[PDB]
Amino acid sequence: PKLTKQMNAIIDTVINYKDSSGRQLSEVFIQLPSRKELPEYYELIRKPVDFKKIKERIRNHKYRSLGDLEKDVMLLCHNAQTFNLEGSQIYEDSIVLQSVFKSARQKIAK
Ligand SMILES: [Zn+2]
């Protein structure tokens, strides 16, 4: 009950986070492109995930702990760093989002 509350609070801090420029870094990660526009993603990436899917898993009670949630958030970021070039905007945003998740988790449910 407060597990669900915690998870939404943690994921909402990640989703809503903005850099010093005002840009919402999560935008690109909310929903993957489908197989059609981007076929190359699904051939290289073995376990695709997006924040909509993570939100679905929280809502439907699929995460047993904060650790299980963290595993999916770390996968999202890892997939982004696999698909995109080191130093690209998307790669670097995923790095910051990893760290946003960890801080939010420490702040919210130490
Ligand atoms: Zn429910």
Short mmCIF file of N, CA and C and ligand atoms in Angstrom, two decimals:
data_model
loop_
_atom_site.label_atom_id
_atom_site.label_comp_id
_atom_site.label_asym_id
_atom_site.label_seq_id
_atom_site.Cartn_x
_atom_site.Cartn_y
_atom_site.Cartn_z
N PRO A 1 0.82 -1.24 0.00
CA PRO A 1 0.00 0.00 0.00
C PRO A 1 0.86 1.30 0.00
N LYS A 2 1.76 1.42 0.97
CA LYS A 2 2.78 2.45 0.93
C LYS A 2 3.99 1.96 0.12
N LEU A 3 4.03 0.69 -0.26
CA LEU A 3 4.96 0.24 -1.30
C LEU A 3 4.55 0.84 -2.64
N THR A 4 3.29 0.65 -3.02
CA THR A 4 2.76 1.27 -4.23
C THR A 4 2.94 2.81 -4.23
N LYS A 5 2.58 3.46 -3.12
CA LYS A 5 2.78 4.91 -2.94
C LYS A 5 4.27 5.28 -3.14
N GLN A 6 5.15 4.52 -2.50
CA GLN A 6 6.57 4.77 -2.68
C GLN A 6 7.02 4.68 -4.12
N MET A 7 6.57 3.64 -4.82
CA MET A 7 7.03 3.38 -6.19
C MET A 7 6.55 4.47 -7.13
N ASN A 8 5.30 4.91 -6.95
CA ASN A 8 4.81 5.99 -7.80
C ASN A 8 5.52 7.28 -7.50
N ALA A 9 5.86 7.48 -6.23
CA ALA A 9 6.53 8.71 -5.87
C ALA A 9 7.94 8.68 -6.45
N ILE A 10 8.63 7.54 -6.33
CA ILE A 10 9.95 7.41 -6.91
C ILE A 10 9.92 7.60 -8.46
N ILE A 11 9.04 6.87 -9.15
CA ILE A 11 9.00 6.97 -10.61
C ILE A 11 8.56 8.37 -11.09
N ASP A 12 7.64 8.99 -10.38
CA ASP A 12 7.20 10.36 -10.71
C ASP A 12 8.31 11.41 -10.56
N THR A 13 9.21 11.26 -9.57
CA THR A 13 10.41 12.11 -9.45
C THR A 13 11.34 11.94 -10.65
N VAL A 14 11.54 10.68 -11.10
CA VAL A 14 12.32 10.46 -12.31
C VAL A 14 11.67 11.07 -13.58
N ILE A 15 10.38 10.85 -13.76
CA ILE A 15 9.67 11.26 -14.97
C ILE A 15 9.65 12.78 -15.09
N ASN A 16 9.45 13.43 -13.96
CA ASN A 16 9.21 14.86 -13.90
C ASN A 16 10.47 15.68 -13.82
N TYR A 17 11.62 15.05 -13.58
CA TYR A 17 12.86 15.75 -13.44
C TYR A 17 13.28 16.52 -14.69
N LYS A 18 13.78 17.73 -14.43
CA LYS A 18 14.19 18.68 -15.44
C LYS A 18 15.59 19.11 -15.13
N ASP A 19 16.41 19.26 -16.15
CA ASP A 19 17.74 19.74 -15.94
C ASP A 19 17.68 21.29 -15.70
N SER A 20 18.84 21.93 -15.58
CA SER A 20 18.92 23.36 -15.24
C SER A 20 18.38 24.20 -16.40
N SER A 21 18.31 23.62 -17.60
CA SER A 21 17.70 24.29 -18.76
C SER A 21 16.17 24.25 -18.78
N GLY A 22 15.53 23.50 -17.87
CA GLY A 22 14.11 23.24 -17.92
C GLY A 22 13.68 22.04 -18.76
N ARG A 23 14.61 21.27 -19.34
CA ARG A 23 14.21 20.14 -20.21
C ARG A 23 13.90 18.86 -19.42
N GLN A 24 12.74 18.29 -19.67
CA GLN A 24 12.30 17.03 -19.03
C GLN A 24 13.02 15.84 -19.67
N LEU A 25 13.99 15.31 -18.96
CA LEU A 25 14.87 14.34 -19.59
C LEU A 25 14.13 13.04 -19.91
N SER A 26 13.09 12.74 -19.16
CA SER A 26 12.38 11.46 -19.41
C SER A 26 11.62 11.39 -20.73
N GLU A 27 11.34 12.54 -21.38
CA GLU A 27 10.43 12.57 -22.54
C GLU A 27 10.60 11.41 -23.52
N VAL A 28 11.84 11.20 -23.97
CA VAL A 28 12.18 10.22 -24.99
C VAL A 28 11.96 8.77 -24.46
N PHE A 29 11.94 8.59 -23.14
CA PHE A 29 11.93 7.24 -22.56
C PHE A 29 10.52 6.80 -22.13
N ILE A 30 9.50 7.68 -22.29
CA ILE A 30 8.14 7.38 -21.81
C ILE A 30 7.55 6.21 -22.59
N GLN A 31 7.68 6.25 -23.90
CA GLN A 31 7.14 5.22 -24.71
C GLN A 31 8.08 4.92 -25.87
N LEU A 32 8.53 3.70 -25.98
CA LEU A 32 9.34 3.30 -27.09
C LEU A 32 8.67 3.53 -28.43
N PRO A 33 9.47 3.70 -29.49
CA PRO A 33 8.91 3.53 -30.81
C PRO A 33 8.50 2.09 -31.01
N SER A 34 7.45 1.88 -31.78
CA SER A 34 7.07 0.54 -32.19
C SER A 34 8.10 -0.08 -33.16
N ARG A 35 7.99 -1.40 -33.31
CA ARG A 35 8.84 -2.18 -34.19
C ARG A 35 9.00 -1.58 -35.60
N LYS A 36 7.95 -0.92 -36.09
CA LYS A 36 7.90 -0.49 -37.49
C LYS A 36 8.81 0.69 -37.87
N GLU A 37 8.74 1.80 -37.14
CA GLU A 37 9.56 2.97 -37.50
C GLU A 37 11.01 2.65 -37.19
N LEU A 38 11.21 1.83 -36.16
CA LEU A 38 12.54 1.57 -35.64
C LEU A 38 12.81 0.07 -35.44
N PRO A 39 13.11 -0.64 -36.54
CA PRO A 39 13.32 -2.08 -36.52
C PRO A 39 14.68 -2.46 -35.95
N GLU A 40 15.64 -1.55 -36.09
CA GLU A 40 17.02 -1.76 -35.68
C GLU A 40 17.13 -1.84 -34.13
N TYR A 41 16.24 -1.12 -33.42
CA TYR A 41 16.21 -1.12 -31.94
C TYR A 41 15.89 -2.51 -31.39
N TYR A 42 14.85 -3.13 -31.94
CA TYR A 42 14.36 -4.41 -31.43
C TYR A 42 15.23 -5.60 -31.83
N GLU A 43 16.02 -5.44 -32.88
CA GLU A 43 17.00 -6.46 -33.23
C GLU A 43 18.22 -6.41 -32.30
N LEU A 44 18.69 -5.21 -31.93
CA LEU A 44 19.83 -5.09 -31.01
C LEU A 44 19.42 -5.23 -29.55
N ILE A 45 18.25 -4.73 -29.18
CA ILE A 45 17.85 -4.72 -27.78
C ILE A 45 16.98 -5.92 -27.41
N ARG A 46 17.45 -6.72 -26.47
CA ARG A 46 16.81 -8.01 -26.19
C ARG A 46 15.59 -7.89 -25.29
N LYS A 47 15.59 -6.90 -24.38
CA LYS A 47 14.48 -6.71 -23.45
C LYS A 47 14.07 -5.24 -23.38
N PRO A 48 13.28 -4.78 -24.36
CA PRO A 48 12.95 -3.38 -24.40
C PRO A 48 12.06 -3.05 -23.23
N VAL A 49 12.18 -1.84 -22.72
CA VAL A 49 11.26 -1.35 -21.72
C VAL A 49 11.14 0.18 -21.76
N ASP A 50 10.00 0.73 -21.33
CA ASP A 50 9.79 2.17 -21.26
C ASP A 50 9.07 2.51 -19.96
N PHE A 51 9.01 3.77 -19.60
CA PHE A 51 8.38 4.15 -18.38
C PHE A 51 6.87 3.89 -18.35
N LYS A 52 6.21 3.96 -19.48
CA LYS A 52 4.80 3.46 -19.50
C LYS A 52 4.68 2.02 -19.03
N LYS A 53 5.57 1.16 -19.52
CA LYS A 53 5.56 -0.23 -19.07
C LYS A 53 5.90 -0.33 -17.60
N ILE A 54 6.86 0.44 -17.12
CA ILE A 54 7.20 0.42 -15.68
C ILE A 54 5.98 0.89 -14.83
N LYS A 55 5.29 1.93 -15.31
CA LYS A 55 4.08 2.40 -14.64
C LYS A 55 2.99 1.33 -14.64
N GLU A 56 2.82 0.62 -15.75
CA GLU A 56 1.91 -0.54 -15.82
C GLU A 56 2.26 -1.61 -14.76
N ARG A 57 3.53 -2.02 -14.71
CA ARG A 57 3.97 -2.94 -13.69
C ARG A 57 3.77 -2.47 -12.21
N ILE A 58 3.92 -1.18 -11.91
CA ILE A 58 3.60 -0.68 -10.58
C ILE A 58 2.08 -0.80 -10.31
N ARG A 59 1.29 -0.29 -11.24
CA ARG A 59 -0.19 -0.23 -11.11
C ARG A 59 -0.79 -1.61 -10.93
N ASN A 60 -0.30 -2.59 -11.71
CA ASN A 60 -0.75 -3.95 -11.65
C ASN A 60 -0.06 -4.81 -10.61
N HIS A 61 0.74 -4.16 -9.78
CA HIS A 61 1.27 -4.75 -8.56
C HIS A 61 2.31 -5.83 -8.90
N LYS A 62 3.11 -5.64 -9.96
CA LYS A 62 4.01 -6.71 -10.42
C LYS A 62 5.37 -6.64 -9.74
N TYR A 63 5.68 -5.50 -9.14
CA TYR A 63 6.95 -5.33 -8.44
C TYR A 63 6.82 -5.71 -6.95
N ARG A 64 7.63 -6.66 -6.50
CA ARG A 64 7.53 -7.21 -5.16
C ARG A 64 8.30 -6.34 -4.16
N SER A 65 9.32 -5.63 -4.64
CA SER A 65 10.12 -4.74 -3.84
C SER A 65 10.59 -3.56 -4.65
N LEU A 66 11.24 -2.63 -3.97
CA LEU A 66 11.91 -1.52 -4.63
C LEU A 66 13.08 -1.97 -5.50
N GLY A 67 13.77 -3.00 -5.05
CA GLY A 67 14.77 -3.70 -5.88
C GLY A 67 14.25 -4.22 -7.21
N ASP A 68 13.03 -4.73 -7.27
CA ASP A 68 12.52 -5.24 -8.54
C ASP A 68 12.21 -4.07 -9.48
N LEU A 69 11.72 -2.97 -8.91
CA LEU A 69 11.51 -1.76 -9.68
C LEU A 69 12.84 -1.19 -10.20
N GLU A 70 13.86 -1.20 -9.34
CA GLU A 70 15.14 -0.65 -9.70
C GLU A 70 15.71 -1.44 -10.84
N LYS A 71 15.56 -2.75 -10.81
CA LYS A 71 16.05 -3.57 -11.90
C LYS A 71 15.48 -3.17 -13.28
N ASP A 72 14.21 -2.84 -13.36
CA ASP A 72 13.64 -2.38 -14.62
C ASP A 72 14.09 -0.98 -15.00
N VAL A 73 14.21 -0.09 -14.02
CA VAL A 73 14.71 1.26 -14.32
C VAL A 73 16.20 1.14 -14.84
N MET A 74 17.03 0.32 -14.21
CA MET A 74 18.41 0.11 -14.66
C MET A 74 18.51 -0.54 -16.01
N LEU A 75 17.59 -1.47 -16.32
CA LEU A 75 17.46 -1.96 -17.67
C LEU A 75 17.11 -0.92 -18.75
N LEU A 76 16.09 -0.11 -18.51
CA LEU A 76 15.74 1.02 -19.37
C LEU A 76 16.98 1.84 -19.72
N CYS A 77 17.74 2.24 -18.68
CA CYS A 77 18.91 3.08 -18.87
C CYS A 77 20.01 2.33 -19.58
N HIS A 78 20.24 1.07 -19.19
CA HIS A 78 21.18 0.24 -19.89
C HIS A 78 20.86 0.07 -21.38
N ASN A 79 19.57 -0.15 -21.71
CA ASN A 79 19.18 -0.27 -23.13
C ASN A 79 19.48 1.00 -23.90
N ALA A 80 19.18 2.12 -23.31
CA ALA A 80 19.47 3.40 -23.90
C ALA A 80 20.95 3.62 -24.19
N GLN A 81 21.80 3.23 -23.23
CA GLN A 81 23.25 3.31 -23.37
C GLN A 81 23.80 2.26 -24.34
N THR A 82 23.12 1.12 -24.53
CA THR A 82 23.48 0.14 -25.57
C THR A 82 23.14 0.67 -26.95
N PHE A 83 21.91 1.14 -27.13
CA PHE A 83 21.48 1.59 -28.47
C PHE A 83 22.11 2.90 -28.95
N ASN A 84 22.30 3.86 -28.05
CA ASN A 84 22.77 5.19 -28.46
C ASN A 84 24.28 5.37 -28.25
N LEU A 85 24.89 6.29 -28.99
CA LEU A 85 26.35 6.49 -28.87
C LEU A 85 26.70 7.09 -27.50
N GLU A 86 27.84 6.67 -26.96
CA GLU A 86 28.40 7.34 -25.81
C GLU A 86 28.59 8.82 -26.12
N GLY A 87 28.16 9.66 -25.20
CA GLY A 87 28.19 11.10 -25.37
C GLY A 87 27.01 11.72 -26.11
N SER A 88 26.11 10.91 -26.67
CA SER A 88 24.91 11.47 -27.33
C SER A 88 23.97 11.94 -26.25
N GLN A 89 22.99 12.76 -26.63
CA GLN A 89 22.10 13.36 -25.66
C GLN A 89 21.29 12.29 -24.91
N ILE A 90 20.80 11.30 -25.65
CA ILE A 90 19.98 10.24 -25.10
C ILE A 90 20.79 9.36 -24.14
N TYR A 91 22.03 9.02 -24.53
CA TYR A 91 22.93 8.23 -23.67
C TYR A 91 23.16 8.98 -22.36
N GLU A 92 23.50 10.26 -22.47
CA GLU A 92 23.88 11.07 -21.29
C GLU A 92 22.66 11.37 -20.38
N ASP A 93 21.49 11.48 -21.00
CA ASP A 93 20.26 11.70 -20.23
C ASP A 93 19.97 10.48 -19.39
N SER A 94 20.15 9.31 -19.96
CA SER A 94 19.90 8.05 -19.23
C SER A 94 20.82 7.89 -18.02
N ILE A 95 22.05 8.40 -18.13
CA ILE A 95 22.99 8.38 -17.00
C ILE A 95 22.43 9.20 -15.83
N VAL A 96 21.92 10.38 -16.14
CA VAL A 96 21.41 11.30 -15.13
C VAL A 96 20.14 10.71 -14.54
N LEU A 97 19.30 10.14 -15.39
CA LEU A 97 18.06 9.52 -14.86
C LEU A 97 18.33 8.36 -13.87
N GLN A 98 19.37 7.55 -14.12
CA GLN A 98 19.82 6.47 -13.20
C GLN A 98 20.09 7.06 -11.84
N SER A 99 20.94 8.10 -11.82
CA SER A 99 21.24 8.81 -10.60
C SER A 99 20.01 9.53 -9.94
N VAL A 100 19.13 10.14 -10.73
CA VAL A 100 17.83 10.60 -10.20
C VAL A 100 17.00 9.52 -9.51
N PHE A 101 16.83 8.35 -10.14
CA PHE A 101 16.21 7.23 -9.48
C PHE A 101 16.88 6.86 -8.15
N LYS A 102 18.18 6.68 -8.13
CA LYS A 102 18.83 6.29 -6.89
C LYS A 102 18.62 7.31 -5.77
N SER A 103 18.81 8.60 -6.07
CA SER A 103 18.56 9.65 -5.07
C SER A 103 17.12 9.68 -4.63
N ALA A 104 16.18 9.51 -5.57
CA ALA A 104 14.77 9.53 -5.18
C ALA A 104 14.43 8.35 -4.27
N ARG A 105 14.93 7.16 -4.62
CA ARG A 105 14.75 6.03 -3.78
C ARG A 105 15.35 6.24 -2.37
N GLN A 106 16.51 6.88 -2.28
CA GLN A 106 17.14 7.11 -0.96
C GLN A 106 16.38 8.14 -0.14
N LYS A 107 15.94 9.19 -0.81
CA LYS A 107 15.12 10.24 -0.20
C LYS A 107 13.78 9.71 0.28
N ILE A 108 13.15 8.86 -0.53
CA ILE A 108 11.74 8.48 -0.30
C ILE A 108 11.61 7.25 0.61
N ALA A 109 12.39 6.22 0.36
CA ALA A 109 12.25 4.97 1.06
C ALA A 109 13.64 4.42 1.34
N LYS A 110 14.37 5.16 2.17
CA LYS A 110 15.79 4.92 2.45
C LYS A 110 16.15 3.42 2.61
ZN ZN B 1 -4.60 -2.04 -7.84
#
